[PDB]
Design a protein around this ligand. Structure first.
Ligand SMILES: [Mg+2]
Ligand SMILES: [Mg+2]
Ligand SMILES: [Mg+2]
Ligand SMILES: [Mg+2]
Ligand SMILES: [Mg+2]
Ligand SMILES: [Mg+2]
Ligand SMILES: [Mg+2]
Ligand SMILES: [Mg+2]
Ligand SMILES: [Mg+2]
Ligand SMILES: [Mg+2]
Ligand SMILES: [Mg+2]
Ligand SMILES: [Mg+2]
Ligand SMILES: [Mg+2]
Ligand SMILES: [Mg+2]
Ligand SMILES: [Mg+2]
Ligand SMILES: [Mg+2]
Ligand SMILES: [Mg+2]
Ligand SMILES: [Mg+2]
Ligand SMILES: [Mg+2]
Ligand SMILES: [Mg+2]
Ligand SMILES: [Mg+2]
Ligand SMILES: [Mg+2]
Ligand SMILES: [Mg+2]
Ligand SMILES: [Mg+2]
Ligand SMILES: [Mg+2]
Ligand SMILES: [Mg+2]
Ligand SMILES: [Mg+2]
Ligand SMILES: [Mg+2]
Ligand SMILES: [Mg+2]
Ligand SMILES: [Mg+2]
Ligand SMILES: [Mg+2]
Ligand SMILES: [Zn+2]
Lengths: 209, 142, 175, 38
RNA sequence: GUGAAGAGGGAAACAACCCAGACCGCCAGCUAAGGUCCCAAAGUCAUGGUUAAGUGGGAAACGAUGUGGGAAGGCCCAGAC
RNA sequence: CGAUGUCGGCUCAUCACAUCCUGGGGCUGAAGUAGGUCCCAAGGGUAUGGCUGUUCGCCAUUUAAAGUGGUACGCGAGCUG
RNA sequence: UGCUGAAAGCAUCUAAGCACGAAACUUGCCCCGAGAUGAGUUCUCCCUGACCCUUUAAGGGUCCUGAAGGAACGUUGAAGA
């Protein structure tokens, strides 16, 4: 089954009658509108290409606006693409609402994580700091040793070192969907999804069930 | 005088279609590498690619002798430290059957830029068909 | 060899179709089909099938004798059928039949259901007894081995699924 | 299963069979007699 | 005996091993060890066998109805196994 | 020997399998539970403290288990001393 | 672990044929990923002028033209050395 493209509005809590506070992540899901249907005869696979949101008319380019004009649909802020299962099809100018998740129970939310910048191995790879006293010379947060002596004159591939942390695609699996509010285009999932506030989210039904 | 050398502009190359059904792998591959090298031509020159383009079809129906179908092992290494990998013959046939012919010929070709240019002329296909009817290829029986 | 030299006489009501190395034998209990080894030369002498080593092959008489005892069993399967009996030893152990799904109750926490293959028909006279009939000998023996495999018989009390004819060598728990 | 370099018949009911390149002793009488050359 | 103080060809590479002792030049021929499917020069040569283990292409005591060949023996159409 | 920093700890590790746990089996002098032994299996996992410079070891209390080794007895142009 | 089954009139899981079988293996889950030079696919957008040259060819030059788009600059960011 396909997913929908939303946006992280923020987090809040749903007080049940029983006295339980459910930490939820509000995901507004506007009308995803299809722009292209891909198939086996032309594209080798079955998928749809959707768009959501709006865009400035002076900023949407002539190739992109011609691509939306062929589908006959308003330009959105992006283009995403969802693989189709069998027995599942959609038309081109079709709009897809959040009622698709009306009877799902768990979703997988894919987002782009927050940018931690250039991070050290303590933060990134959870390395232990060395001793803050007892003689330590300028070596409190360094990674320590990185190899062995002459046997493989070389550091191995994938050695855990410092570098860019975050700002990348991650997927949180098996999030309990709490509420599907079709009237104001919302989706409340239990827990914390990746991404900052106002960033794009991809909500798909859970594959692991 | 001086010994003739072939020239890459004046050299002519031809197209051949080989059906690989039932043929032995290495005994096919050394004739393929002979005709990609150009050692069947009197204008052979070691530093010049004078061989012919060869299309090999029915690559999944190539035959090996013995128990090599279940016992021949294709090792490779991913670069990473545990990264030794391993696939048998019938696993390579199920997964990507073109690699078996490609590996045997690449092992029988010269090593270098010219041997890689000779390998670029080998065009293998698992099926019984090809998109290269435009080059009017002749059949070759090996 | 000594098995392969003795020809197999096809009876009446047994239809034989020769096709290369493939032999289809029909009858009043079903049809059976088997491709022989290429080392085997088979021919029908109007009342018997004969089985000879085709030349240029190492296991000549070995493959011929295997193809002999096979088509003998295929003939008996298509004119009489085979019947394998199983019995259940143990308290609370039982069996029930639903068409081609034996519903075993072998002292587990879950019900045991076994789907029967195509040409195999089963029947429980008693709850602690299974009688299965069919054409192919390899299939009735495989199904009986599979049904035995759920409760292989314990050597201390003989408890579990056994063949109705096998002997169960017991053992006393010493101290 | 005894696994040895030297496998032998231990009783009258032992039978030496070569299954898949491995010498194996099987005994219908005693299950202790079943062996496997390795 | 070679190296040291000796190059060349082969043994993958490999001072001391195998063949063989470099005056110079040649886009000439024959050969040595070693080789002749391709990398990589030359037999997918011929005839007759053996092996099924990739043995070849690493190893012992010991173990085994693997298989090929040879010579002999004791039961046996009074009927063997 | 016109210099290859040699114990132990710390920090990063990585490979082998002669497997400690977990997984699959065979035999048991295997009633069950719990075990003994051998075979397959290296995917992941695999204590904290007292003493002592210690590795080790003993001891205390845990844990499914507290593996055996290689790596310049891994790692001082990474720390300590 | 078996089934059928000879070789070896029996027997036999194997030689022909068939079935089951583990945290290992390949998948399934997540991420990068066409510099995958074997450089792939789909969709959309843009440009539809005149002439000279000699060594005439994937040739060189003049004038007109300057598209889609991009870059630069600026305001900046839960992006960032
Ligand atoms: Mg940031
Ligand atoms: Mg610390
Ligand atoms: Mg200092
Ligand atoms: Mg400090
Ligand atoms: Mg190196
Ligand atoms: Mg070379
Ligand atoms: Mg010399
Ligand atoms: Mg040399
Ligand atoms: Mg020499
Ligand atoms: Mg050598
Ligand atoms: Mg000569
Ligand atoms: Mg010679
Ligand atoms: Mg040659
Ligand atoms: Mg020194
Ligand atoms: Mg020095
Ligand atoms: Mg055990
Ligand atoms: Mg082992
Ligand atoms: Mg481990
Ligand atoms: Mg795995
Ligand atoms: Mg301690
Ligand atoms: Mg104290
Ligand atoms: Mg190591
Ligand atoms: Mg050591
Ligand atoms: Mg050390
Ligand atoms: Mg160092
Ligand atoms: Mg140190
Ligand atoms: Mg250094
Ligand atoms: Mg059998
Ligand atoms: Mg039999
Ligand atoms: Mg299976
Ligand atoms: Mg687990
Ligand atoms: Zn025995």
């Amino acid at each position: 089954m396909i997913g929908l493209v939303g946006k992280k509005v923020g987090m809040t809590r749903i007080f049940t009658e029983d006295g339980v506070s459910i930490p939820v992540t509000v995901i507004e899901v506007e009308a995803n509108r299809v722009t292209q249907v891909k198939d086996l005869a032309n594209d080798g696979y079955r998928a749809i290409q959707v768009t959501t949101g709006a865009k400035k008319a002076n900023r949407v380019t002539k190739p992109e606006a011609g691509h939306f004009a062929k589908a006959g649909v308003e330009a959105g802020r992006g283009l995403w693409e969802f693989r189709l299962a069998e027995g599942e099809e959609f038309t081109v100018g079709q709009s897809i609402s959040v009622e698709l998740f009306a009877d799902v129970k768990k979703v997988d939310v894919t987002g782009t994580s927050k940018g931690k910048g250039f991070a050290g191995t303590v933060k990134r790879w959870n390395f232990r700091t060395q001793d803050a006293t007892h003689g330590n010379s300028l070596s409190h947060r360094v990674p320590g040793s990185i190899g062995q002596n002459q046997t493989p004159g070389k550091v191995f591939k994938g050695k855990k070192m410092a570098g860019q942390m975050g700002n990348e695609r991650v997927t949180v699996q098996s999030l309990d969907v709490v509420r599907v509010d079709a009237e104001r285009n919302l989706l409340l999932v239990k827990g914390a999804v990746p991404g900052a506030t106002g960033s794009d989210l991809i909500v798909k039904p859970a594959v692991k069930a | 005088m001086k010994t003739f050398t072939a020239k890459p502009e004046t050299v002519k190359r031809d197209w051949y279609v080989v059906d690989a059904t039932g043929k032995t792998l290495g005994r096919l591959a050394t004739e393929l590498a002979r005709r990609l090298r150009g050692k069947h031509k009197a204008e052979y020159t070691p530093h010049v690619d004078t061989g012919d383009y060869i299309i090999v079809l029915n690559a999944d129906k190539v035959a090996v002798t013995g128990n090599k179908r279940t016992d021949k092992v294709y090792y490779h290494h991913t670069g990473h430290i545990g990264g030794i990998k391993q696939a048998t013959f019938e696993e390579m046939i199920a997964r990507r059957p073109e690699r078996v012919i490609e590996i045997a010929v690449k092992g029988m070709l010269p090593k270098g830029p010219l041997g890689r240019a000779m390998f670029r002329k080998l065009k293998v296909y698992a099926g019984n068909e090809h998109n290269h009817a435009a080059q009017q290829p002749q059949v070759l029986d090996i | 060899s000594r098995v392969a030299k003795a020809p197999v006489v096809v009876p009446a009501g047994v239809d034989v179709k020769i096709n290369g190395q493939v032999i289809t034998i029909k009858g009043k209990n079903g049809e059976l089909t088997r491709t022989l080894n290429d080392a085997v030369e088979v021919k029908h002498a109007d009342n018997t099938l004969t089985f000879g080593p085709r030349d240029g092959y190492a296991d000549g008489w070995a493959q011929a004798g295997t193809a002999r005892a096979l088509l003998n069993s295929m003939v008996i399967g298509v004119t009489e059928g085979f019947t394998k009996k199983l019995q259940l030893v143990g308290v609370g152990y039982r069996a029930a039949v639903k068409g081609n799904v034996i519903n075993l109750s072998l002292g587990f926490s879950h019900p045991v259901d076994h789907q029967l293959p195509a040409g195999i028909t089963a029947e429980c006279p008693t709850q602690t007894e299974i009688v299965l009939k069919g054409a192919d000998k390899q299939v009735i023996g495989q199904v009986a081995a599979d049904l035995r495999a759920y409760r292989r018989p314990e050597p201390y009390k003989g408890k579990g699924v056994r063949y109705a004819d096998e002997v169960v060598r017991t053992k006393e728990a010493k101290k | 299963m005894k696994v040895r370099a030297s496998v032998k018949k231990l009783c009258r009911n032992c039978k030496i069979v070569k299954r898949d390149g491995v010498i194996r002793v099987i005994c219908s009488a005693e299950p202790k007699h079943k062996q496997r050359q390795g």
